[PDB]
Structures are given as C-alpha cells and as structure tokens.
Design a protein around this ligand. Structure first.
Ligand SMILES: *[C@@H]1O[C@H](CO[C@@H]2O[C@@H](C)[C@@H](O)[C@@H](O)[C@@H]2O)[C@@H](O[C@@H]2O[C@H](CO)[C@@H](O)[C@H](O)[C@H]2NC(C)=O)[C@H](O)[C@H]1NC(C)=O
Ligand SMILES: *[C@@H]1O[C@H](CO[C@@H]2O[C@@H](C)[C@@H](O)[C@@H](O)[C@@H]2O)[C@@H](O[C@@H]2O[C@H](CO)[C@@H](O)[C@H](O)[C@H]2NC(C)=O)[C@H](O)[C@H]1NC(C)=O
Ligand SMILES: *[C@@H]1O[C@H](CO[C@@H]2O[C@@H](C)[C@@H](O)[C@@H](O)[C@@H]2O)[C@@H](O[C@@H]2O[C@H](CO)[C@@H](O)[C@H](O)[C@H]2NC(C)=O)[C@H](O)[C@H]1NC(C)=O
Ligand SMILES: O[C@H](CNCC1CC1)[C@H](Cc1ccccc1)NC1c2ccccc2-c2ccccc21
Ligand SMILES: *[C@@H]1O[C@H](CO[C@@H]2O[C@@H](C)[C@@H](O)[C@@H](O)[C@@H]2O)[C@@H](O)[C@H](O)[C@H]1NC(C)=O
Ligand SMILES: CC(=O)N[C@H]1[C@H]([C@H](O)[C@H](O)CO)O[C@@](O)(C(=O)O)C[C@@H]1O
Ligand SMILES: *[C@@H]1O[C@H](CO)[C@@H](O)[C@H](O)[C@H]1NC(C)=O
Ligand SMILES: *[C@@H]1O[C@H](CO)[C@@H](O)[C@H](O)[C@H]1NC(C)=O
Length: 526
C-alpha cells in the first residue's frame, strides 16, 4: 500500500496483529537532515522527492550517549537506542489500522530520556497494538537530544536553543498537512509522552506556535515545572562556554564558536557534554529546554501561574516509585543486586548526591520531613525515604502542582496513580513501581498473550488502553462498559485521582499532601 504525501509517495509494510492487520510506515523523513551548516539550527523544510520513499524499517536514532552502568542487563538496555546513531535522524513513524480508517483520532508519542537520550524505535513504543485494538492512528518522531538538540546562545539563530522541541513541532506540523491522506483526523490529535517526553508535551501547551497542532494532552511522569525540566539562561550560557572550552572552540565572535563546534565530529561533542555541568546528578539535564524567546516567550512557571496556555483537557499521572530507578545510578549503599538497606549516614550522603548545590540547612530539612518514622525500627526506613525524596521532588509533586494550576483555568483534568509492578520487570523488588514501567501497559504489550504477562496484566492494560483512547477521542477517559470505576475530574479543592492496579481501582484524594507541601511551598525558599 502506497500513500501520496505532500512531498511524495511513501511505501508501507503490513503487520499481522491479533488475527488482523496494521499498516506501518516506519522512518518517514520530516525535515532536511540537520547536518553541516545546519547543525544546531532549527529544523528546515523538506524538498519534494519524486520516487517512492521506502518507509519499511525504523530510521537512524539521533546521536546520544549510551547508559553503560549495567552492560547486558535488560532493565537498562531496553532504553538504549536500537538503530544506528546518526545526526541524520529527523524521521517519524505512522501506524494506521487496516482496513484504512475514515477519520481516526491520532495519537502522537514524544519519548523521554532526560532530553539527552531516547528514540521512537524502542520496543515499548510499538504503536501497532494501539492501532489494532482501538483503531487510532499512532505517530512517533525522533528529535535531537543533548547539546545537538538544545545547545543555547539566546538570540543567536546559529544555536538558538530548543531545536529538539522545534523538531517535535515540525513533526506535529507534518501530521496536520499529511495525516488525512492516511485516514487520520488532523482535528483530533492527542499528544502523549513520558518523563522528558511528558515535559515536552506540557511545553507544547505553553508554546503559541503549537496551539493549532493538537487537541488534547496526556502527561506520564513528567511536566515542565519539574526541577530538571528547564535550563536557565544563566546555566545554558555557562554550559555552552564550557563546551567551547572543552573542544578548543573558545572564540569571541559568538558565531565563530558555532562554526568551530560545527567542524567537530559528533563523537567529540558527546564526550564533552558530561563535564559541562560542574556537579552532575543522576537526573542532570546538561542541555535541555530554555527560555529562547521563540518556542518559549517567558519563564514557564509564570505562564502556568497566569493562565497563558492552551485551553483543553489534560490527562496527568505518576507512578508509585518514581524515585528508585535513580538511587542505583549514584547513591551510596544502593545496588540492584541486593536489598540496599542503608544507614542514616548513607541516606545523608545520598542527599549530597541528589542535592549537590543545596545548603547544609536545606539538606537537614529534607532529612527532617522524611525521617519521622511511622516505625523507627524498620531497616528499610532510609532506603525507602531516599527513593520517596527523589520521586516526590522530581516527579510526583511537580505533576500535582501542574494539574492544580492548569485546572484552575476551567479545563477538565484527570489524574492517575499507577501502582502495578510489571510481572516481567527485571529490576529487583525493592525498587517497586519504577519510573517508566507504566509505558508497557499504555502501549498494550500485555495484550500479547505470547509474552509472560499474567491475565491480570492483560486486563489492566486492556482498560488503560481503552481509557487513553477514549480520552484522545472524546476527552473523557472512562471505560463505559465493563462496569469500571468512573474516573472523576481533578478539581483543585477535592483533588480526586484514580489508582490503576490489577486488584481494585479506587478514587482517592490529595495524593502525597504532606510531602508536596514541603517541596512546593517550603523547599523553594532555600
Ligand atoms: C473528519 O471529522 C471532522 C470532524 O471531527 C471533529 O473534529 C473536532 C471538532 C473534534 O473536537 C471532534 O468534535 C470531532 O472528531 C470533519 O470536519 C469537518 O471539516 C469541514 C471541512 O473539511 C468543516 O467545514 C466542518 O466544519 C468540519 N466539521 C466539524 C464538526 O468540525 C470532517 O468532515 C471529517 N472528514 C471525513 C469524515 O472524511
Ligand atoms: C561555570 O563555569 C565555570 C568553569 O567550569 C569549569 O570548566 C569546564 C570546562 C568544566 O570542566 C567544569 O567542570 C569546570 O568546573 C565553573 O567554575 C569552576 O568551578 C570548579 C568547582 O566548582 C573549580 O574547580 C574550577 O576551577 C572553576 N573554574 C572556573 C574557570 O571558574 C563554575 O562553577 C560554573 N558554574 C557557576 C555557577 O559559576
Ligand atoms: C549492596 O551492594 C553495595 C554495592 O557494592 C557492590 O555490590 C555488591 C552486591 C558486591 O558485589 C560489592 O562487591 C560491590 O562493590 C554495597 O555497598 C558497599 O559496601 C561496602 C561496605 O559496606 C563499601 O566499602 C563499598 O564502598 C560499598 N559500595 C558502594 C557504596 O558502591 C552494600 O553494602 C550492599 N548492601 C547489602 C545490604 O548487601
Ligand atoms: O538512564 C537514565 C537514568 N538517569 C541516570 C543518568 C546517568 C544516565 C534514564 C534511562 C532509564 C534507566 C532505568 C529505568 C528507566 C529509564 N533516562 C534519563 C536520562 C539520561 C541521561 C541524562 C539524564 C537523564 C534523565 C533525567 C530525569 C529523568 C529521566 C532521565
Ligand atoms: C523500495 O522497495 C521496492 C519494493 O521492495 C519490496 O519490499 C522491500 C521491503 C524488499 O523486501 C523488496 O525485496 C520488495 O520488492 C523496491 O522494488 C525498490 O527497489 C526499493 N527502492 C529503494 C530506493 O530502496
Ligand atoms: C547479578 C544477577 O543477575 N542477579 C540475580 C538477578 C538480579 O539481581 C535481579 O533480577 C535484579 O537485578 O535476579 C535473580 O535473583 C532473580 O530473582 O531472578 C537471579 C540473578 O542471580
Ligand atoms: C563577527 O560578529 C559579527 C556580529 O558582532 C557578525 O556580523 C560577523 O559575521 C562575525 N564574523 C564572521 C566572520 O561571521
Ligand atoms: C470487557 O470484558 C470482556 C470479557 O468479558 C473482554 O473481552 C473485553 O476486552 C473487556 N473490555 C474492556 C474495555 O476491558
């Protein structure tokens, strides 16, 4: 099956999914390759081609550093890129149902990875199940990460910043111009992403250039007001200058530096990205979004607080154990290969790792709020406390605060709390319901009866997929049929949220209330 797009014909391939068929278009280009003089610049528009572009395999992933902490371990390596790294990486994928739909709701995925890593070709991002089961069209794109996607000299178009966000945006534009030819409805587009993907989604709700490119938004374990999500104009300059010094590209003509950095191999630039931060943490975002004055006209907390954003429905949520994944990438006494019972002194040293530039008093205050023990004798007390600290500060409390702020301007919001630990999850049991391990269920992998998921997980994925699709299609994430628990809207007074798990789906109120008052009211003062 061949589809004419605005720049030429693309050839797809046919997949067999659950005694049915999905048509996949893998690796459609959506921009000029950002090579040569185009490196660091905004994405540029594609010239027409006259042949039939063969979009039958995933394209190159964007250049990025690889996580090497656990060679050969599936828990880490399932996130590493699975196509060639290349600067020539601006491509996207389309999964359309067979038979070709008439006017199908579109779902556009934006992956995470700290704005430094990630790729759409990952196994847990396979959109074929969603196309098959719910008859939506699924789209995902590669966008530039790390310095190549977010190096910033504010105002200088040679490296203005937010390039990777503009990559995402050009891809949203491609869906507006072309998805009708695939049987998709450009007027029913829902963005969803996880982690830095989710924070990207939240920034598309703030960027005026994106408002007409989508209908609704879903934010999984991430939002722009998370402390790791935005780099300051200060740090972006200090980081850019450090990179120039590390590469021997220190000049004075601000442009003669970009020229110099444009003659370096991608590998030299990736080498030096690690040391532009003076003190890194497991959550360091060396090169991320900035207030460029183009994609983002003001500091996003101000836009949020004053209601300057797209008015539409949002779906937001977090996992029970967001913080534990990061503990084994640096904290003392932690190991994925033992139960990581840490002492008080280990805990204290762990705060220095995750809060390097924070005062003695700031760290004491974290210790104080999180070491009032419901039982003071439990040996896991400090191990659990450190994960909760990292998770509440870095994910859970910023997401709650985004949802409160956003819903105060009249729009329906739905909040979930994911607390099912995958039965195939390769990390140890003390790490719990980890960051990123709801994605399997959102994409419907447990629906594959061949895998090792239980029947309970098939049913739970089955409802999540239904709820997500009903949110994309109708702005209302109900499962109206198998007598499901009704998901209430998140109001700033009541703060009702839905818990997702295999046993019992319940309505609760005011998640992590005590913890988030500390992080969102007090801690910003220090
Ligand atoms: C494709 O469907 C659209 C209508 O879909 C709606 O879009 C949003 C308003 C969303 O919020 C939901 O209500 C729906 O999913 C049809 O759009 C029409 O397009 C013509 C121009 O082409 C325009 O003049 C009409 O006003 C549009 N109708 C509406 C209700 O906005 C479109 O006709 C459908 N195309 C098909 C079925 O081929
Ligand atoms: C802003 O940048 C300076 C310079 O960073 C140093 O050089 C880079 C190439 C890279 O290797 C960094 O890791 C270096 O630290 C920072 O100042 C340095 O601070 C460290 C300790 O904090 C000190 O040992 C160095 O001698 C300092 N060098 C210089 C030139 O000042 C500075 O900390 C950065 N951040 C801030 C907030 O100023
Ligand atoms: C859990 O393991 C950590 C990490 O040690 C590594 O993993 C072990 C499973 C084993 O293979 C070690 O040889 C590895 O180096 C332990 O932390 C170490 O503890 C010792 C003494 O307490 C200390 O000298 C080391 O510096 C620590 N290593 C670190 C912090 O990286 C930890 O004690 C183990 N805990 C339990 C409960 O088993
Ligand atoms: O391998 C990172 C975990 N971090 C540690 C840094 C040293 C590599 C993560 C991939 C992963 C691992 C285990 C379980 C689930 C996902 N993906 C990113 C990331 C990559 C590089 C730099 C910063 C970040 C960052 C920052 C905040 C949130 C998420 C992430
Ligand atoms: C594009 O693909 C055309 C048809 O390819 C068919 O499917 C692919 C996946 C292969 O398995 C091939 O053997 C099949 O015939 C080719 O005829 C054409 O040459 C290709 N063009 C380019 C530029 O690759
Ligand atoms: C070093 C190593 O691979 N150790 C063990 C792994 C991992 O520690 C965990 O899966 C989390 O990493 O898990 C087992 O205990 C398990 O119960 O399957 C078997 C294996 O010996
Ligand atoms: C030097 O900087 C100026 C702006 O200050 C710029 O116009 C000029 O092009 C730069 N030099 C070169 C060789 O590009
Ligand atoms: C509802 O239950 C039936 C089994 O009785 C199942 O086949 C179907 O997939 C379920 N639907 C949803 C949306 O969970």
């Amino acid at each position: 099956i061949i589809i004419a797009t605005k720049n030429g014909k693309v050839r797809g391939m046919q997949l067999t999914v659950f005694g049915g068929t999905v048509t996949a278009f893998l690796g459609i280009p959506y921009a000029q390759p950002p090579l040569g003089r185009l490196r660091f610049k905004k994405p540029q528009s594609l010239t027409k081609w006259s042949d039939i572009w063969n979009a039958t395999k995933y394209a190159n992933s964007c250049c990025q550093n690889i996580d090497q902490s656990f060679p050969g371990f599936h828990g880490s390596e399932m996130w590493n890129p699975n196509t060639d790294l290349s600067e020539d990486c601006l491509y996207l994928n389309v999964w359309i149902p067979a038979p070709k739909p008439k006017n199908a709701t579109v779902l556009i995925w934006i992956y995470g990875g700290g704005f430094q890593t990630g790729t759409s070709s990952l196994h847990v991002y396979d959109g074929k199940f969603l196309a098959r089961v719910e008859r939506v069209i699924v789209v995902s794109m590669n966008y530039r990460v790390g310095a190549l996607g977010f190096l910033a000299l504010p105002g200088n178009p040679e490296a203005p910043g937010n390039m990777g966000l503009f990559d995402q945006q050009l891809a949203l534009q491609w869906v507006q111009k072309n998805i009708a030819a695939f049987g998709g409805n450009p007027k029913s587009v829902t963005l969803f992403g996880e982690s830095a993907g989710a924070a990207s989604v939240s920034l598309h709700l703030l960027s005026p250039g994106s408002h007409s490119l989508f209908t609704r938004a879903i934010l999984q374990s991430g939002s722009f007001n998370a402390p790791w999500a935005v780099t300051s104009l200060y740090e972006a300059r200090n980081r850019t200058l450090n990179l120039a010094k590390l590469t021997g590209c220190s000049r004075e003509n601000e442009t003669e530096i970009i020229k110099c950095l444009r003659n370096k191999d991608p590998q030299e630039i990736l080498l030096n990205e690690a040391f532009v931060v003076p003190y890194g943490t497991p959550l360091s975002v060396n090169f991320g979004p900035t207030v460029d004055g183009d994609f983002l006209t003001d500091m996003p907390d101000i836009l949020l607080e004053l209601g300057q954003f797209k008015k539409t429905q949002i779906l937001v949520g977090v996992n029970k154990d967001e913080g534990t994944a990061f503990l084994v990438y640096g904290a003392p006494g932690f190991s994925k290969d033992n139960n990581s019972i840490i002492t008080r002194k280990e805990f204290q040293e762990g705060l220095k790792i995750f809060f390097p530039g924070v005062s003695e008093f700031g760290k004491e205050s974290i210790l104080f709020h999180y070491t009032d023990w419901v039982d003071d004798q439990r040996p896991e007390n400090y191990r659990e406390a450190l994960g909760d600290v990292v998770g509440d500060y870095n994910f859970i409390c910023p997401a709650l605060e985004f949802t409160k702020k956003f819903s105060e301007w009249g729009n329906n919001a739905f909040f979930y709390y994911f607390e099912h630990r995958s039965s195939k999850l390769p990390w140890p049991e003390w790490m719990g319901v980890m960051h990123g391990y709801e994605i399997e269920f959102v994409f419907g992998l447990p629906l594959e009866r061949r895998d090792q998921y239980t029947k309970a997980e098939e049913i739970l994925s089955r409802s999540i997929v239904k709820r997500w699709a009903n949110f994309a299609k109708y702005g209302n994430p109900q499962e109206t049929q198998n007598q499901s628990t009704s998901w209430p809207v998140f109001k700033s007074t009541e703060q009702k949220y839905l818990t997702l798990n295999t046993e019992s789906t319940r309505i609760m109120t005011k998640l992590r209330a005590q913890q988030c008052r500390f992080w969102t009211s007090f801690f910003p003062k220090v």
